[PDB]
């Protein structure tokens, strides 16, 4: 029976609760307390039974990340009404232009208990590092910046390669947020602290909920268990073990098949509009991108034990003019748990292609540099851009364009069944036999029959089938001259 | 309509039935002839559908091993029947103590059809180089040679686990009949030609029948789908393929969900019991080995593109003194299509280890010596045997002991929900972190987080969950130590 407001429908009256809601949770050190609630995701670390060895609770890059934000935000919430709240967690619609950062936050003075937080833990406030995130453009379709993200995770299908469009485009405010401060919002293991933080991921869970229901409009209803759901049953952590908010719902409701429904934590928000459009009327928007065929670049992202941001470079014909096809960010942090994008990372690089006039399986690789929270890091984990065709009219099919040689990446599933597969015959060195499926994850590790070409994958073709696939060097040794093995999979 | 009765129980009227409709066959050179059937396993490959590449039919260490030679071997009887036949192919018990090779090849004289055949396609008849396959020891019970590894075949319970069992124990025959010939019964990509060949098969293939029917007393019906499935969703070719004997049956019966079945191809054998056993009464001497702790030698063998011999030699606590700890065979040939077993290979050499008075768990390992038909060859690829041991009372758990550092394998899957997992801390250099499941397919290539002590993998430990797991080094260096990335798995 409650409700999470919009925060610019807010009303001072209204505003009063929420601070005073807060407050009171931010001078409680209790387990129920503000300071033990945002160390659930951030240090301290807790989570493993007494296992002496620290361990980030933190769920990002996991096929459950949503999941685990999901509760946790209620997590806060709860936490709030339970300490003298009226109305829920108030969310921000970032996507829509913006023209400055919300006035609950920016309201430094007056000790505005939503503007920062002092981790009292390990001393040291919540600081943010604002970055510029403006510059209007164009917005109701085509929008530049988040809302082309967002609607762009809206747009694909299925969860599973839902979720990373979901955790890439909420990984972008972060940064802005907390720029490139050491505690700041953008830094994984503190981020939690920040009062914004709280907030912001309630902001992020709304687009979910319009997503969840909107793809039962499309016959196509995913949310529980659908691809990799074998991560889903098993328990958040730590909301089960025993140290959590105490909140009977959390403590036991803490199965990710439960979470999955927000209408069971006692909770609605004051609409389902995003950008100002309503369900029927952004389900058009939607169809203006399906009707224009666009180039994306496939990525195979992994856990670089650490948050930062990565700027695509475009190659040029000219002799290597680059150029800013975009830019993305890594969540992540030192002492992190391991992770690996199963499924491609849509990123639409269109436009950028079209200048320089390359084709998606002809010769066309580009080389991005990444970068910390500040300085300069390893850009070499690329890995290797797994460039990816969406057709316009007609679509749900995706042709997936890997690569021949030079590339570096681990099974990548493109998953739903029924998309296209090929191979770029990049490096006239190599020509265009690539085995494929060698055989079992054994054989995977390059072993190749002499000559006797185990045809299935050729020059520029395709596929339609589902199961497991698999990618092989087209001889034993033209595999190691690049580690040719990309397994590809499907469902 | 039809049965498969002993050739032992044969008679000089039934045997004439046999010598004349497998002569006919011989002499018959259509797509339905002698020649053109054993074509379909060895030599010349056909299969692929015009992709001048050949490729041997024969499917074996696939878990449709025994799915695609149980058709085959029906393949050549309903030939010969069309071609004027009687009774069934006769089935020859090889387990029972072997005195002398069967009467029905020996007799080389009288231009014996079932002895050898001229090949016709490239000339060379079918010879071969008997090698001894005998040594009495004693029956009922613990019998030296062959039978033990079948009634170890009955022994192993579900199918995937069973299927190595059920190949192995073929494996053997083949090289004793074949020896080392050039197109023997031994060497893969001939074998087929060979008289013995067509009616061997048969001989196990009633072995399978008896341990079909024989799961389904003990509440564990396993037969069709079970375990790695999605490789039988698949007709076996060149059954379905346009070109095959054309027996209404075989071309359109060839889905391997359908072969599973005896029943169903019209014939039966005189019995179903082995080494002069019934069912009930074999059942008991099954009981005998359950009663008795045995440890195991766990194999993961993958395909060595040939045929060979593999000698398992134990080491001793003298200096280096070896021991025949016994042996057996892998089937292959150049130009096969590639193989892995999933799934471990049980291999007993308890009495061989109590001698030398080792433990499973602590510092126990070996070096075998392979041997191609005739010649020496890289006896390097082992893969590290995995040491397994199988309590007695109280079964169907059974333990799985890995090995820490120096180990070579890729994803075993001990499978069979339910078992038992460890380590082997070989080497004190290498202490017992062992990651454990790391994440997916794409963290298993080494990426171990920051000392992050992710438990689950100890010392001398155990399991008892499901599902798929997975085992890494403690730390990223010492991965590439020894490249240790044994991906378990289970069901
Ligand atoms: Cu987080
Ligand atoms: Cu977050
Ligand atoms: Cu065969
Ligand atoms: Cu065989």
Redesign the pocket.
Known sequence: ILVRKNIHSLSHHEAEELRDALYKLQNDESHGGYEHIAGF?GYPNLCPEKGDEKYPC?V?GMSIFPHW?RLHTIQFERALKKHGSHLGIPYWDWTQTISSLPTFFADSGNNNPFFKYHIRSINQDTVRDVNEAIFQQTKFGEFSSIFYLALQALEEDNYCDFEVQYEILHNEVHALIGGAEKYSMST?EYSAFDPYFMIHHASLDKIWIIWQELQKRRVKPAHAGSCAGDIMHVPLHPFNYESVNNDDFTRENSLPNAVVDSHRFNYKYDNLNLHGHNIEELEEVLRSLRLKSRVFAGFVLSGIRTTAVVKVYIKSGTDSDDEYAGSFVILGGAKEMPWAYERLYRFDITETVHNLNLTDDHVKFRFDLKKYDHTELDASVLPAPIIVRRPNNAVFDIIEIPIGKDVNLPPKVVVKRGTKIMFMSVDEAVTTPMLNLGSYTAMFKCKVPPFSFHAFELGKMYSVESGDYFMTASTTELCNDNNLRIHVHVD
Do not use: I
Request: charged letters at 0%; hydrophobic letters at 20%.
């Open positions: 995701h933190c990002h934000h994984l």
